Amino acid sequence: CTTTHPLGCERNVLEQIAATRARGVRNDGPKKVLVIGASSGYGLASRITAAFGFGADTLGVFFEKPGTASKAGTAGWYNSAAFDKHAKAAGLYSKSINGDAFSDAARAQVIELIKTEMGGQVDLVVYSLASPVRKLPGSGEVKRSALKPIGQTYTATAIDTNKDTIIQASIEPASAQEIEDTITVMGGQDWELWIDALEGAGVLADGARSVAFSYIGTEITWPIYWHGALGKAKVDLDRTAQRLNARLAKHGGGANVAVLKSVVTQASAAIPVMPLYISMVYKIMKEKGLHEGTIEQLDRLFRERLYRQDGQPAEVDEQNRLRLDDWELRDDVQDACKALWPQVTTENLFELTDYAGYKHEFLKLFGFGRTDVDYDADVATDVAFDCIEL
């Protein structure tokens, strides 16, 4: 999708705001929150849960393209503009930075705003799934991640989303360089640089916590999302989390990876097996009452793991990860997937899966397909908000 609808994006944001408010606005969770990757998907939902679910002041970092009078910007630009407008209306502090989250300049700008505008400290640092290209600070060398298996070719049933057909799709295995570079991009190195910088600047509150988002997914995609090159990066991420946890614990806080569920995203839409699995699991989970989108995931993370009213510590897996893919990875859900997977064809795709839902949710990312938006009305693409351009 090559265009976006600003008002649609605003209504998406308003829908998430309403959803978290409906779960109860709390005042005993985070107060000063930094979200790295704050403009879309899980990052955006985390910002909305923090601000509108917990009344927190927020600073978001993202890389998007601003709109001009004649050309639409990216969805994340309009999402963030909507967030800012409504957060300010709600009397909250809301500031944003548009630029490269991997860069030292982004860290410096964040630190300056925390010191000068936010009261001097943050108590929660959210680290969203990073971009797949990383310019290294100092050297300027650019590393690129690879979503490839290791050791052999990966082949799986998939959807050609341009034709609404079932295909077989294959991915060739990673080189050693691709494995290393994927660790460099999708591992924990930059997350640790952020915590380093914040600590060094004295802007981490006593008790500050950090959470980095991750994903494991289903058995049919294990060779690429759980194992493979990305899997090696996740090992690095998980290792980093436990290192950061010990570090922040010395000051009363902690750190965790939170493994989240499968949801429609721009990134995985490009990987043909994923629209198929997502479509399938959406249908199965909706029937079982277990379906969640980004805002439900983040509300459950905040309310049932990080800031439990019963004051108890969050439950974790063997690697000290928070798991919000708990409902998805139930035997009943996954077994139902296993039963349907071999049956799917072009002729029955829409009937065996929620592929209609997938297509709707994909267009929704960009602000299209809502039932409460007049898409015939004029669109103003030049939208300004409180955002520093690096």
Numbering used by the authors: 12 to 401
Quote the original article.
In particular, enoyl-ACP reductase, which catalyses the last reduction reaction in the fatty acid elongation cycle using trans-2-acyl-ACP as the substrate in an NAD(P)H-dependent manner, is a vital enzyme and, therefore, is a promising antimicrobial target. It exists in a variety of organisms, including some clinically important pathogens and serious plant pathogens, such as Vibrio cholerae, Yersinia pestis, Pseudomonas aeruginosa, Burkholderia species and Xanthomonas species.
The density map was of high quality and allowed us to build an almost complete model containing 390 residues (C12-L401) but lacking the His tag and thrombin cleavage site at the N-terminus and A402. Strands β1 – β4 and β9 – 11 form a parallel β-sheet located at the centre of the structure. Unlike the strands constituting the β-sheet, strands β5 – β6 and β7 – β8 form two anti-parallel hairpin structures. Structural comparison showed that the locations of the conserved tyrosine and lysine residues in the Y-X8-K motif of xoFabV and the Y-X6-K motif of ecFabI were notably similar, despite the fact that there are two more residues in the former than the latter.
